[PDB]
Design an enzyme around this catalytic site. Structure first.
Site, PDB file in Angstrom:
ATOM      1  N   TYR A  38      -5.925   4.319  -1.315  1.00 52.22           N
ATOM      2  CA  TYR A  38      -6.382   3.396  -2.305  1.00 52.22           C
ATOM      3  C   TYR A  38      -6.768   4.238  -3.574  1.00 52.22           C
ATOM      4  O   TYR A  38      -7.196   5.319  -3.352  1.00 52.22           O
ATOM      5  CB  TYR A  38      -7.645   2.623  -1.895  1.00 52.22           C
ATOM      6  N   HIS A  40      -3.981   0.981  -4.472  1.00 53.81           N
ATOM      7  CA  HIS A  40      -2.500   0.947  -4.361  1.00 53.81           C
ATOM      8  C   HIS A  40      -2.104  -0.393  -4.956  1.00 53.81           C
ATOM      9  O   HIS A  40      -2.986  -1.315  -5.173  1.00 53.81           O
ATOM     10  CB  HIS A  40      -1.949   1.326  -2.992  1.00 53.81           C
ATOM     11  N   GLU A  58      -5.288  -2.876  -6.030  1.00 51.90           N
ATOM     12  CA  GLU A  58      -6.489  -3.181  -5.166  1.00 51.90           C
ATOM     13  C   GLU A  58      -7.171  -1.937  -4.710  1.00 51.90           C
ATOM     14  O   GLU A  58      -6.687  -0.856  -4.389  1.00 51.90           O
ATOM     15  CB  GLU A  58      -6.308  -3.916  -3.883  1.00 51.90           C
ATOM     16  N   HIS A  92      -9.630  -9.892   3.306  1.00 53.89           N
ATOM     17  CA  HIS A  92      -8.787 -10.166   4.477  1.00 53.89           C
ATOM     18  C   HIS A  92      -9.622 -11.053   5.461  1.00 53.89           C
ATOM     19  O   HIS A  92      -9.098 -11.689   6.357  1.00 53.89           O
ATOM     20  CB  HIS A  92      -8.582  -8.859   5.300  1.00 53.89           C
ATOM     21  N   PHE A 100      -4.564 -12.587   2.491  1.00 51.18           N
ATOM     22  CA  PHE A 100      -5.838 -12.551   1.825  1.00 51.18           C
ATOM     23  C   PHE A 100      -6.268 -13.991   1.454  1.00 51.18           C
ATOM     24  O   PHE A 100      -5.464 -14.912   1.320  1.00 51.18           O
ATOM     25  CB  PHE A 100      -5.846 -11.837   0.469  1.00 51.18           C
TER      26      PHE A 100
HETATM   27  O1  VO4 Z   1      -4.632  -1.967   2.112  1.00 49.15           O
HETATM   28  V1  VO4 Z   1      -4.872  -3.623   2.226  1.00 49.15           V
HETATM   29  O2  VO4 Z   1      -3.778  -4.568   1.264  1.00 49.15           O
HETATM   30  O3  VO4 Z   1      -4.067  -3.728   3.754  1.00 49.15           O
HETATM   31  O4  VO4 Z   1      -6.193  -4.579   1.757  1.00 49.15           O
END
Ligand code: VO4
Ligand SMILES: [Ca+2]
Length: 104
Positions: A38, A40, A58, A92, A100
């Site tokens: 992240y 990403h 996100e 999630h 989501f």
């Molecule tokens: O990395 V996640 O899109 O699976 O929140």
């Protein structure tokens, strides 16, 4: 009161602002953290009405209020765009698989 609530987690606008600033700086640095890398890209296949344009990214926002640094990212995320404009807070929690729902 909560500015955003994801499941049982309550976030204030300062919590969202703090998490976005950290996610945005890694994105400018071309850096990622965590096993899931992240921040990403985020694809809006669910069609959330965000008023800011794409592309989107996100980054996890943690209930503890700590900035994400690796480890379990939990279920909630801040979504921001290329211009560092906040698009929304999603989770999630209460969604199947890796779908989501928006935080309210
Ligand atoms: O990395 V996640 O899109 O699976 O929140
Ligand atoms: Ca907080």
């Amino acid at each position: 009161a909560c500015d955003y609530t994801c499941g049982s987690n309550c976030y204030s606008s300062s919590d969202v602002s703090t998490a976005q600033a950290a996610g945005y700086k890694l994105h400018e640095d071309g850096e990622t953290v965590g096993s899931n890398s992240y921040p990403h890209k985020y694809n809006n296949y669910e069609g959330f009405d965000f008023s800011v344009s794409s592309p989107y990214y996100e980054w996890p926002i943690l209930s503890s209020g700590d900035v994400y640094s690796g480890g379990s990212p939990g279920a909630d995320r801040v979504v921001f765009n290329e211009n560092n404009q906040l698009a929304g807070v999603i989770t999630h929690t209460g969604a199947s698989g890796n779908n989501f729902v928006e935080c309210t």
